[PDB]
Amino acid sequence: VKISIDPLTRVEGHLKIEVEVKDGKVVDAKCSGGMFRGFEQILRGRDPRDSSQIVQRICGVCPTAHCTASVMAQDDAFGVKVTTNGRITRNLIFGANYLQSHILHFYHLAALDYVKGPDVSPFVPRYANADLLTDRIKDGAKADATNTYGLNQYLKALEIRRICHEMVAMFGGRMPHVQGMVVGGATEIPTADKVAEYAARFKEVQKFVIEEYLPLIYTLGSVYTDLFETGIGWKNVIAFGVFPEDDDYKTFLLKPGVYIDGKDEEFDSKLVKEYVGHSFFDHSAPGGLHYSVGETNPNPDKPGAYSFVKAPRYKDKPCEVGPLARMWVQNPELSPVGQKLLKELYGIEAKKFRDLGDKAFSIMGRHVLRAEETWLTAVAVEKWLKQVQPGAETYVKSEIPDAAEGTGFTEAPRGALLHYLKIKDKKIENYQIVSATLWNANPRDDMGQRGPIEEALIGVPVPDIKNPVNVGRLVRSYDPXLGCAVH
């Protein structure tokens, strides 16, 4: 039996998911990105400095990630060495949106697959047999208490995510689409007053993450333990490193790294290539293109193609990205809340992320990693608010070079992100973006290997074809951003 879902809602952008189900399980899958804009084409001929504003429009949910990648690509090309205060300030602007993005995702995008909302649009209509907390918990009072607990958090989170945007705006100017990050650093030197204001807002957000978000995640997982055992996929993950902790970019809050076929290895950017065999693009050569020589020639007519998302591979292997990838790669210590709740609710003794072991790689493992990463990012932001120096220079003035190349590496809330810039005659000659969801929501490559999401869908239980809840649940655990995946 085939099931097609278009639009797959509560995901950013245009996404179509098609699966074949057999014996109550998904046996095949195809993922399609249905909207293309062509930023890599639009940027050509422009003043290189404009890119940090233009690329932000790739996505209104994660604009700071693209802005960061862009200003680093420009710093690289222009030969700019950022100041300590400039580096810290850009982490503060970006860190506030990491918090916003994850909170936005869990509650406002993922939570409606588990929490029964009020009986008014857009909470209804919904699948009739939605397998919500209210359907799973048989004791009436406990079911109401848990659903209400989750719903009240959904509502409070609407306000929490807004406060994180006030935090981004503090040194970023406004949000969505900041004005504060440019090649050379940050445009506004932090004042002691503004740092205190960011901190006061920050305290409220951190409190919510620790007292509400983490507790709900772990509680949710304890109800949906079956979801820690499906939505596996490739089990290959990659991270480029985010939030440089020193001016030479030698250290990061979460390190660059790769985990493929059960082995951890250091990341080498020379092994990243994009395939377009089943994507709506023409490449001048078969075998995949390294990003430094990437091409953006759209072709909706290409026989065999089914998506505007190109297919990135590392050493020819599909690798997933996002919180799970960073957390697996870095293996940080789990929050006090998680350590305690894993013991109390699951009988699991864990101190580090990898202690989730086997299935950190599942629908629930992805939500857990994202919640833990939120707490981890919050711990770091509190540290940065102490390192930032009011009055210290945040900006270095640089000039557009006649001809140069630059590459910016970072991690968007959804995964690994790089921007490659090439200048000629002081203008953008080529601009290539290898962005987050691109790695997760890609179609089959030329050799025929499924993208991480298509692969993770294989095996997902669909006992009810008319109410295929786990398909959307698996897809949303990746927090896909199709605007980013296609650009």
Binding site: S4, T9, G13, R37, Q41, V61, P122, Y127, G483
Partner: protein
């Protein structure tokens, strides 16, 4: 009674939607529960696929002539509208392009509100270098011969007050037209309420400007004119309203990039080169 809304996305970045989530007059929970009945919105709605599309089409007929069609993102006409597939109708196959959806829904709406510079004027997706045949809602209406009230609420993204304010004013008018007037629009179809003021004329740095005191750098004192500020040729009330609950704004932080204008971005570029 709540204003019925069907929110559709074409070539958008979801930035207009996120900006709406940041509203404070009133906050998003009150907007959704007390002000509008958000019937369809791909980013936040419970239902998906056929159920989501069927509900949208169901509302479009039942509320035919009584729902606001909100458009986020531009409309691509090249390659038979295949650069933006918004859905797949249940009746065997039938991929719906943004072109098809708007052509269908816009005539049944009470009014179409193009939120964001993308839908209003084309914006970034329609800028030089695109090959998608990206179009604004007004240009698409003309091509399609669609005769429907269209309000443009530009900005990249628009401030939530402009979006909410325009919609509340429009809904009050629908409810009691002889007592509540529609927002007065400029020649570019945008509300004079929010886009009548010139940034530069209302800018706090104006005295520095008039005294030739220009910041040589982003972090030096003075007017931002030399840094590329497009406030002189930009009409929005940002200098008084500011952004993110009055926390900061583009000009104080850096430079205005003229995001609300019909010629954004090409006419406002380079961004870091003085007008």
């Amino acid at each position: 009674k709540k204003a019925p809304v069907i929110w559709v996305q074409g070539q958008g970045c979801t930035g207009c939607s996120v900006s709406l989530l940041n509203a404070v007059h009133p906050r998003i929970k009150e907007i959704l529960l007390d002000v509008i009945s958000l019937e369809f919105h791909p980013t936040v709605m419970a239902s998906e696929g056929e159920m989501a599309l069927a509900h949208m089409y169901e509302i479009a007929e039942k509320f035919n002539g009584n729902f606001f069609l909100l458009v986020e993102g531009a409309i691509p006409t090249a390659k038979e509208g295949r650069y933006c597939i918004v859905g797949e109708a249940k009746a065997h196959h039938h991929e719906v392009t943004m072109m098809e959806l708007i052509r269908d829904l816009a005539p049944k709406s009470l009014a179409t509100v193009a939120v964001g510079t993308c839908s209003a004027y084309g914006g970034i997706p329609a800028a030089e270098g695109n090959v998608t045949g990206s179009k604004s809602v007004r240009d698409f209406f003309a091509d399609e011969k669609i005769e429907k009230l269209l309000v443009n609420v530009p900005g990249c993204p628009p401030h939530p007050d402009w979006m909410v304010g325009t919609l509340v004013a429009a809904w009050s008018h629908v409810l009691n037209p002889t007592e509540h007037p529609l927002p007065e629009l400029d020649d570019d179809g945008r509300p004079l309420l929010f886009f009548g003021d010139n940034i530069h004329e209302n800018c706090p740095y104006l005295d520095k400007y008039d005294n030739s005191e220009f910041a040589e750098t982003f972090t030096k004192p003075g007017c931002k004119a030399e840094l590329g500020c497009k406030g002189p040729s930009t009409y929005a009330d940002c200098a008084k309203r500011r952004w993110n609950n009055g926390i900061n704004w583009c000009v104080e932080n850096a430079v205005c990039i003229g995001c609300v204008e019909p010629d954004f971005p090409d006419g406002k570029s380079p961004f870091y080169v003085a007008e």
